Write a protein that binds this ligand. Structure first.
Ligand code: HEM
Ligand SMILES: Cc1cc2nc3c(=O)[nH]c(=O)nc-3n(C[C@H](O)[C@H](O)[C@H](O)COP(=O)(O)O)c2cc1C
Length: 169
């Protein structure tokens, strides 16, 4: 059995948790960024685990496009987002990723972990249009601040549980 972990990451959060997933998996496995897809033959992999960061409650474009090149693959996701993992927003994100993976592939499971908001985006949040767009989103300031320390051990434990559940202990 061969497992591929293939990910998008701009500021490293998704890469970080996907690297933990790679470490925890036993047996044959490869981890690459999506940009290096040509380094492997997708046909050789029984499990495809896609790492994605949340962009407006959905998979980031690079990861969305990659998933939409796949058909009938046994597929999983590992997502990062800045919202609280207990929030309704996170549940909406999880459902959106489930819908994306299940549409044309064979979706088994996924996990969301938390990741800090980039310095650049934290600055843009104080400017038009993001400040107006999120004006009435509750707890906006604290959500961003409480994401700053993530990913951290709490997220790695979520990854460990996800790998335990789906691949091996
Ligand atoms: C460039 C970055 C972002 C953009 C362009 C963006 C865009 C939007 C837009 C347009 C909406 C209104 C709903 C819609 O029309 O789709 C929205 C709502 C919301 N955004 Fe963002 N957002 C960004 C970053 C973030 C981040 C970093 C967080 C969390 C830390 C966040 C959390 C939310 C929440 C909780 C809502 C309320 C609606 C919901 O629960 O989905 N957003 N955002
Ligand atoms: C353009 C953009 C849109 C984002 N939209 C959301 C969002 O809708 N919900 C959320 O919780 N986090 C959102 N975030 C925060 C990222 O999902 C989070 O910081 C992620 O861990 C970054 O991953 P990376 O470091 O692998 O690039 C957004 C970030 C960016 C840059």
């Amino acid at each position: 059995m061969k497992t591929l972990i293939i990910y998008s990451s701009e500021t490293g959060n998704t890469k970080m948790v996907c690297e933990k997933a790679f470490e925890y998996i036993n047996g044959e496995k490869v981890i690459i960024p999506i940009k290096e897809e040509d380094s492997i033959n997708l046909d050789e992999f029984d499990n495809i685990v896609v790492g994605t960061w949340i962009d407006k409650a959905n998979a980031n474009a690079e990861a969305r496009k990659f998933i939409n090149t796949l058909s009938n693959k046994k597929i999983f996701f590992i997502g990062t987002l800045a919202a609280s993992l207990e929030s309704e927003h996170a549940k909406k994100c999880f459902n959106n990723l489930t819908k994306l993976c299940s549409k044309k592939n064979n979706f088994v499971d996924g996990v969301l972990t938390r990741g800090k908001v980039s310095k650049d985006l934290q600055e843009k949040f104080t400017k038009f249009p993001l400040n107006i767009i999120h004006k009435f989103v509750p707890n906006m300031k604290e959500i961003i601040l409480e994401a700053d320390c993530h990913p951290n051990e709490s997220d790695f434990l979520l990854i460990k549980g996800f790998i335990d559940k789906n691949f091996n202990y």
